[PDB]
């Protein structure tokens, strides 16, 4: 940023010693939206709904 | 991901509300991560969650 930033989404932190998936989750959802509104996007928030899958035996 | 998969196979409406409650940031930290609550223990708690073995394993 002290070199000309287009910081579209504030940094996010993960503490391995506590709740790394909480924070990773917070930063992520906030993140997609920051960039969404920014430009636009392709899956919002929509979805991709391909909760993908496979199992057959 | 595991909780959503279970919620989606749950035909116990209040039981679906509870599994979804666990997705919230605070509940997830305090009731899932702090106590190390597993998918297996939730399947035992919810015998009418229609998840099947092959979806479990995967």
Question: Which whole-number Å values give the CA distances from A31 to A16, A41, B14, B22, B27, in the listed order?
Answer: 20, 12, 32, 22, 22
Where do the DSSP E strands lie in chain A? none
Q: Residue B31's closest CA among A26, A22, A29, A27?
A: A22
Asked if A55's CB is within 8 angstroms of B57's CB, the reply is yes
For chain A, what's the residue count? 57
List the determination method: cryo-EM
* Resolution attained, angstroms: 6.5
Residues of A within an 8 Å Cβ radius of B = 19, 21-22, 25-26, 51, 53-57
A1 touches A9 (CB < 8 A): no
Q: How much is the CA Rg of chain A, to the nearest whole Å?
A: 16
Asked if A53's CB is within 8 angstroms of B58's CB, the reply is yes
Distance CA B16, CA B49 (A): 9
Eight-class DSSP state of B49: B
Q: Tell me which chain B residues have a C-beta less than 8 angstroms from the C-beta of A54.
A: 58
Which residue in the block uniquely carries the two structure tokens 């997705």?
A: B23
Distance CA A29, CA A41 (A): 14
């Amino acid at each position: 940023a002290a070199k000309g930033a287009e910081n579209i989404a504030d940094r996010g932190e993960a503490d391995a010693s506590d709740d790394f998936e909480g924070t990773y989750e917070e930063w992520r959802e906030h993140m997609w939206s920051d960039v969404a509104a920014y430009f636009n996007l392709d899956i919002e928030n929509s979805e991709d709904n391909k909760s993908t899958l496979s199992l057959q035996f | 991901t595991q909780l959503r998969a279970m919620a989606a196979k749950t035909v116990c409406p209040p039981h679906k509300v509870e599994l979804e409650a666990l997705l919230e940031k605070q509940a997830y930290k305090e009731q899932v991560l702090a106590k190390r609550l597993t998918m297996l223990e939730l399947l035992e708690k919810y015998p009418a969650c229609e998840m099947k073995f092959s979806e479990f394993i995967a």
